Amino acid sequence: GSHMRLNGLSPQQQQQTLATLVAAATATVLGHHTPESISPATAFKDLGIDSLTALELRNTLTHNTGLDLPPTLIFDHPTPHALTQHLHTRLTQSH
């Protein structure tokens, strides 16, 4: 399918999955490549996100999740954690 239909896994299992996604996404988006060096409690701002990459990240996430998201994600829900919650919602909410 063209969606992150990752249902079947427990909520947290799914989260950490997409958490790693989000992390690897900005790891790539910032250019430091490591998703393990991504602090969820730190805000993407402090992590190095620019307005462009706040959009580029959204680009990667919306691509990976297979959904459609605003380039204001990072601004409305700023932190790897904030997005881990948003993206987890998006994928599980399919109505």
The Cα 33–Cα 19 span in angstroms is: 15
Experimental method: NMR
Sign of CA dihedral 29, 31, 37, 39: negative
Q: How far apart are CA 4 and CA 64, in angstroms?
A: 7
9: CATH:
1.10.1200.10
User: In total, how many domains does the chain have?
Assistant: 1
Domain span at residue 75 reads 1-95
CA dihedral 66, 68, 74, 78 (to 10 degrees): -70
Structure tokens that stand for 60 in this block: 């990667």
